[PDB]
Ligand binder design. Structure first.
Ligand SMILES: [Mg+2]
Ligand SMILES: [Mg+2]
Ligand SMILES: [Mg+2]
Ligand SMILES: [Mg+2]
Ligand SMILES: [Mg+2]
Ligand SMILES: [Mg+2]
Ligand SMILES: [Mg+2]
Ligand SMILES: [Mg+2]
Ligand SMILES: [Mg+2]
Ligand SMILES: [Mg+2]
Ligand SMILES: [Mg+2]
Ligand SMILES: [Mg+2]
Ligand SMILES: [Mg+2]
Ligand SMILES: [Mg+2]
Ligand SMILES: [Mg+2]
Ligand SMILES: [Mg+2]
Ligand SMILES: [Mg+2]
Ligand SMILES: [Mg+2]
Ligand SMILES: [Mg+2]
Ligand SMILES: [Mg+2]
Ligand SMILES: [Mg+2]
Ligand SMILES: [Mg+2]
Ligand SMILES: [Mg+2]
Ligand SMILES: [Mg+2]
Ligand SMILES: [Mg+2]
Ligand SMILES: [Mg+2]
Ligand SMILES: [Mg+2]
Ligand SMILES: [Mg+2]
Ligand SMILES: [Mg+2]
Ligand SMILES: [Mg+2]
Ligand SMILES: [Mg+2]
Ligand SMILES: [Mg+2]
Ligand SMILES: [Mg+2]
Ligand SMILES: [Mg+2]
Ligand SMILES: [Mg+2]
Ligand SMILES: [Mg+2]
Ligand SMILES: [Mg+2]
Ligand SMILES: [Mg+2]
Ligand SMILES: [Mg+2]
Ligand SMILES: [Mg+2]
Ligand SMILES: [Mg+2]
Ligand SMILES: [Mg+2]
Ligand SMILES: [Mg+2]
Ligand SMILES: [Mg+2]
Ligand SMILES: [Mg+2]
Ligand SMILES: [Mg+2]
Ligand SMILES: [Mg+2]
Ligand SMILES: [Mg+2]
Ligand SMILES: [Mg+2]
Ligand SMILES: [Mg+2]
Ligand SMILES: [Mg+2]
Lengths: 93, 46, 271
RNA sequence: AGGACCGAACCGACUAAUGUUGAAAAAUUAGCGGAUGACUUGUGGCUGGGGGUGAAAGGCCAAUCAAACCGGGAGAUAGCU
RNA sequence: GCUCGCCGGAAGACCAAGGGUUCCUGUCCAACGUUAAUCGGGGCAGGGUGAGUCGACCCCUAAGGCGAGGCCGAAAGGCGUAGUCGAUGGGAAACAGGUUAAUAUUCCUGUACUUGGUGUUACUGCGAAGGGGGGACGGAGAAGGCUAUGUUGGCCGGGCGACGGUUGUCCCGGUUUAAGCGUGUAGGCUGGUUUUCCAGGCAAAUCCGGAAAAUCAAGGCUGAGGCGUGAUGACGAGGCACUACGGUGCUGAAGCAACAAAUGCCCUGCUUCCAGGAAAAGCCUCUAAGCAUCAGGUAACAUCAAAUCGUACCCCAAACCGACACAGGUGGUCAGGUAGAGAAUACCAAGGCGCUUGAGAGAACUCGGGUGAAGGAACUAGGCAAAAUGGUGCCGUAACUUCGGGAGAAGGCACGCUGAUAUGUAGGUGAGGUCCCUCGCGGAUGGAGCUGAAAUCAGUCGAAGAUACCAGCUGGCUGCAACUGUUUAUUAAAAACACAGCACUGUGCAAACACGAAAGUGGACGUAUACGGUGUGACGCCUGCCCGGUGCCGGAAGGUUAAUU
C-alpha cells in the first residue's frame, strides 16, 4: 500500500495532443505526465485514488529532451516520463 | 581506407572512463590535474 | 603402422604418418578430462618467454595417473587411446572395484590385459613396484624420483630406463640420455618400455603440419639486423662471429648446468 | 583425400593508364594472385618505449618510429645563420 | 501527371555497432546546400518512441581483470589463495490480422504460452556449500526425407482490343492464412526388466560405477515434415457510395492440384580422418547433518505478480569512421523471373533511383572508346599497351618424370531452328483400383496424370548457330628458389623471409632458457622418440685436407696471482 504523499506527488499533468485525444475517444486511454521515477504500480494506484476510476493497465515511456539553440548557447530540455493509462471500459473520466 | 578511430563505447569507458582513472595512483593524478585546471569534463564518461 | 602418402600434391609427397588401428575411435572418457588453454609462450607478465609457440589445435587435458598408488587391486585394460598432450599413448584401465583410470601404455599392452601395482605384483609389463623389488637389469619406465611423487623419467614414446645396480638405499639407473643416476630404492617404476616406439618415424611433410602442433616459424639470427640479434647485419651473407644465442651466450658446446644441490646423485654425465 | 585444380563472394596488390593545388594525405578503371587453409572475419582481452611485437622489411606500435606521444628539467647548448 | 533512362546478390529490405532528434506536421529562405530554390538531413514552433514473451537488466561461466588474509618488494607497489567480476558463448515463455502524419511481435481484435508467490483439497520422506548424470561441443564428405519457394494446369472475376487477325489450345488479375494444441511419421540412437553382492564416487547414498544370477525380447529416448484443429473466422480480385481528391466508408467470388526445388530443416544425425575438437549454471537424480503426523515434496484447482531501462530515425550511408552532403572503409540476415553450372553475366519483378550547376557550339590538344587499305614488332630498354585465345561433348596428345604428373600439352570435329524416331523417348514422380496384415502418417501390386533430357535421321535459314554479355594465347631453350605461403601500411613481392628435412650443441627436471630487485610465471600440468639455441634448407649423388690463429671442451704437475693474515 503506497502512502498518500507519494500518490500526490507522482502525477504531474495531463498530456494534450492529437494522439492523446484519439486514444481517449478510441481506446479509453488517458495520457499523463508523471514523475520521472514513478513506476507502473504507483501510477495505477494514484490514478485509482485521485480520479476515483478503475484502471486496466498502465504503459509508460521516457521522453528524451530536445537539444535547443537559444542565442549562441546550446541548451537541453529535461527528460520526462509519460504514461498511457487505460481505463476499465466503463468509467469515462 | 580504414582510419584509426573505430569508435566503441565499451572500450572507450574501460580504457578512459572514470572508474578506470580512479583505479590507479596515476589515474588519480590525472583526475587531480584536470580538477586543478578547471576542466568541465573530467573524463570521457560525461 | 608407418605408411607413406602418395605424392598427389607437393604437400603430400613427403608425408609419412604413423597409424595405429588399435586406438579407440570414439570420444575420450569424460570424467578424466580438463581444459588447458594455450599460452602462446607468454608468462603472467604477458611477455613472450619461450619463442616459437602459438596457435595449433584445441586440446583437452587427460588426467593421467603417474603415481600408480592404489595397490593390490587388479585392473584390466579397456582400450588404448590417443592423447594430444604427449607422444605416448594412454590406456584406460578399469579396477576391480569399479574405478577407471588413465595410464601410460607400455609396449605390448592391449585390451584385456591384467595390470597391478604394489610390492607383491608379478614382474610383468605394466605392473608397478618399488624399485627395491625389481630385479637388477630390468627395463622400466615412468620412474619416480622422490618416493610418492609420481613418475618423471622415461615417459616419452619408446623410452625406458635400465636398472644397472643396487646398493643400500639407492639404485643406479641408466637414462635414455646415456647418463647414470642414483635414486632411492623406494621410488616406484613400471615394468617394460613405453609404447608407440615408431613415433619418431613420422615425417610432417609440410609447414602447415608443424603449424597444427602450435609451432611458429623460427627466424635465423643471421637474417636479422644487428639491433635484433648478435648475428645480424652484413652486406650480403656475412657471419664472422662465434655463434651465440639471442642473448649473447655462446651456443655451440658451452655447458650450462649449474646445480650443486643435485650433483651428488649424478654418477656419470651423459657425454 | 589434398597447405589439389578452374572460378564469384571475401582477402590481397603484379602491370598499365588516369589523378598528382586529386573524387581520395595512397584512390579509380581494365586486366592480375589466393580462394578448405601456414585461410579470412566480428566481439572482447593481453604485451608499453632502449620496451613490446616482428614467416626479419629496421617493418609496425593511432596519417609520427635507427628509439612513440604528452608534460616537465628548459629560456638545454648553438665558436653557426 | 505522362513518357524516357539506371540498379535489382543492390543503388532493394532488415539487424548489430556507431550517431542522437537527423523522424512527422506547420511555417520561413538571411546564413548553410559548390547554381536558383517555393525545396532540404538548414532556421523556428509543435508532435512522436507504449512490451510478463524482443533486447538489456538477471542466473552461469571463457580469455582476462580485481583480489580479504598471504608471499614478495627502499616507498610507490608486484604476484596470487578464498572469492568476486567479465560475452563475443550456455539459461522460461507469442503468433496472425488491423491501425498512426509519425510506434508497434509493445496499441486494438482473435487465439496462445512461461515462470514465480499465496490459498485450498489429495497423497506423501523432505533436506547441500557434497556425489552422479546432463548441459557438452572438431574438420571434411555423402546421401535420403522434406519445406521455403517457383512453374504449370484447374477454379474464380474481368476482357473481345487505336493497325491485318483475335469466342479461343486466347488476354489480364487472384487463387493467402500463423503461433499454439492433437497425432508421433521419413529417419537416428539404445537391448529391456527384476533380485543379490562390492577395496570405487573424500562421509552417506535406494543414484552412478563394477560383479553375479534369472527372465523377456520389445521397451525407451530423439525426430523434420505431413495431416486435423486454430479458421462458420481473418484476408481477399473487384464492385458500390462518398472525397474535405490525399483518400474515407460499405461489400466481397475462387481460395484447389501436380511438378520442380534449396547453400534452409531432419542434422548437436550418419560415414570418415587426424591436427583428437570450451567452462559453469539452469535441469534430472542421490543421499549427509537436520526435521519429523511439523516443515518440506508431488498433483489439481483458484487467485495474484512479472518491476526497471531501450524502442523515433540513418545503418555499404548526405545521419557511422574519413576536416566536406568526400568516387574510400564498415560485421550479420533476406535472396523472385527468363537464360545460365552459378550468389558470374545480360534483361527484368518487388522496391528504389536519374548521382544539387545548367544552356550552346561541334577548333587545336587531353582523357575514355570504335573502325581501318598494304605491311605485320620494322616500335621499344623490353611486344609496354593493344590485338588475339576463350564454352560443352567426343577424338587425340611429346621430351622428361620424384610415376602423381607434364596435360586443358599441342591439334581437330560437332553445335541454330523444324519434323520424325516417340501425337513426349530413356528416366523421374506418382493418383485411382485391387490384395493383405499386428488398421496405420501401414505393406504389395498398380499404373492415370504430371514432368522430361540426351541421341540419331531428314529438312531448312543466314556471311556467320559456344552468334550478345561471359569466356585459357600457345610452343622451345635457360638462370634462380624445391613446392603452398610471408614481406618493406604509402616508389622494392623478389633470387629476400619461412618451410618440411638435415646436423651440431645445451638440458636429468626445482631442466636448460626467458620475463622479473623478489615472490613468482612461461618452458609444461611436458620428462631426452622431450624441450631450448644455432646453422643449412624438399628430393638425388655427395659433403675432401688444415686444430697453426680465434673460440669452446677437458686436465691440473709446475709458474704467476685477490680479499684475508
Ligand atoms: Mg498491454
Ligand atoms: Mg517500456
Ligand atoms: Mg624453437
Ligand atoms: Mg628449424
Ligand atoms: Mg635484411
Ligand atoms: Mg649487438
Ligand atoms: Mg659478400
Ligand atoms: Mg671473410
Ligand atoms: Mg587450393
Ligand atoms: Mg600486405
Ligand atoms: Mg581492380
Ligand atoms: Mg582460384
Ligand atoms: Mg638494410
Ligand atoms: Mg604509422
Ligand atoms: Mg636515444
Ligand atoms: Mg638546466
Ligand atoms: Mg632556445
Ligand atoms: Mg537495366
Ligand atoms: Mg536540429
Ligand atoms: Mg524529413
Ligand atoms: Mg532570393
Ligand atoms: Mg544558394
Ligand atoms: Mg529540419
Ligand atoms: Mg578468473
Ligand atoms: Mg592480482
Ligand atoms: Mg592485501
Ligand atoms: Mg558472476
Ligand atoms: Mg551475449
Ligand atoms: Mg517507421
Ligand atoms: Mg511447397
Ligand atoms: Mg524502428
Ligand atoms: Mg552531392
Ligand atoms: Mg560516401
Ligand atoms: Mg570487409
Ligand atoms: Mg550481378
Ligand atoms: Mg570531340
Ligand atoms: Mg583517342
Ligand atoms: Mg580496335
Ligand atoms: Mg591496318
Ligand atoms: Mg587488312
Ligand atoms: Mg602474319
Ligand atoms: Mg628491333
Ligand atoms: Mg629502332
Ligand atoms: Mg600485356
Ligand atoms: Mg583486349
Ligand atoms: Mg646466364
Ligand atoms: Mg619460391
Ligand atoms: Mg611499398
Ligand atoms: Mg609493389
Ligand atoms: Mg617452474
Ligand atoms: Mg640460406
Amino acid at each position: 500500500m503506497i502512502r498518500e504523499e507519494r500518490l500526490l506527488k507522482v502525477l504531474r499533468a495531463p498530456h494534450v495532443s492529437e494522439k492523446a485525444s484519439t486514444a481517449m475517444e478510441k481506446s479509453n486511454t488517458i495520457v499523463l505526465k508523471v514523475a520521472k521515477d514513478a513506476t507502473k504500480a504507483e501510477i495505477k494506484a494514484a490514478v485509482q485514488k485521485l480520479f476515483e476510476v478503475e484502471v486496466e493497465v498502465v504503459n509508460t515511456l521516457v521522453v528524451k529532451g530536445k537539444v535547443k539553440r537559444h542565442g549562441q548557447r546550446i541548451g537541453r530540455r529535461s527528460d520526462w516520463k509519460k504514461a498511457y493509462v487505460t481505463l476499465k471500459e466503463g468509467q469515462n473520466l | 581506407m580504414k582510419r584509426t578511430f573505430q569508435p566503441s563505447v565499451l572500450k572507450r569507458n574501460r580504457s578512459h572512463g572514470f572508474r578506470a582513472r580512479m583505479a590507479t595512483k596515476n589515474g588519480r593524478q590525472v583526475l587531480a590535474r584536470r580538477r586543478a585546471k578547471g576542466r568541465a569534463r573530467l573524463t570521457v564518461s560525461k | 603402422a608407418v605408411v607413406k602418402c602418395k605424392p598427389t600434391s607437393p604437400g603430400r609427397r613427403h608425408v609419412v604418418k604413423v597409424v595405429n588401428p588399435e586406438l579407440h575411435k570414439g570420444k575420450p572418457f569424460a570424467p578424466l578430462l580438463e581444459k588447458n588453454s594455450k599460452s602462446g609462450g607468454r608468462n603472467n607478465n604477458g611477455r613472450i618467454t619461450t619463442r616459437h609457440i602459438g596457435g595449433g589445435h584445441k586440446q583437452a587435458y587427460r588426467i593421467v595417473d603417474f603415481k600408480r598408488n592404489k595397490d593390490g587391486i587388479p585392473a584390466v585394460v579397456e582400450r588404448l587411446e590417443y592423447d594430444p598432450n604427449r607422444s605416448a599413448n594412454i590406456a584406460l584401465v578399469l579396477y576391480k572395484d569399479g574405478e577407471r583410470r588413465y595410464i601410460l601404455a607400455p609396449k605390448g599392452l592391449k585390451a584385456g590385459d591384467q595390470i597391478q601395482s604394489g610390492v607383491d605384483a608379478a614382474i610383468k609389463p605394466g605392473n608397478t613396484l618399488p624399485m627395491r623389488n625389481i630385479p637388477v637389469g630390468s627395463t622400466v619406465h615412468n620412474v619416480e624420483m622422490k618416493p610418492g611423487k609420481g613418475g618423471q623419467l622415461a615417459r616419452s614414446a619408446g623410452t625406458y630406463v635400465q636398472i644397472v645396480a643396487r646398493d643400500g638405499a639407492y639404485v643406479t639407473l641408466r637414462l635414455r640420455s646415456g647418463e647414470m643416476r642414483k635414486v632411492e630404492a623406494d621410488c616406484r617404476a613400471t615394468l617394460g618400455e613405453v609404447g608407440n616406439a615408431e613415433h619418431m618415424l613420422r615425417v610432417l611433410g609440410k609447414a602447415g603440419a608443424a603449424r597444427w602442433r602450435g609451432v611458429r616459424p623460427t627466424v635465423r639470427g643471421t637474417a636479422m639486423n644487428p639491433v635484433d640479434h648478435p648475428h645480424g647485419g652484413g652486406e650480403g651473407r656475412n657471419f664472422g662471429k662465434h655463434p651465440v644465442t639471442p642473448w649473447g651466450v655462446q651456443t655451440k658446446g658451452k655447458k650450462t648446468r649449474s646445480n650443486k644441490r643435485t650433483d651428488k646423485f649424478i654418477v656419470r654425465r651423459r657425454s
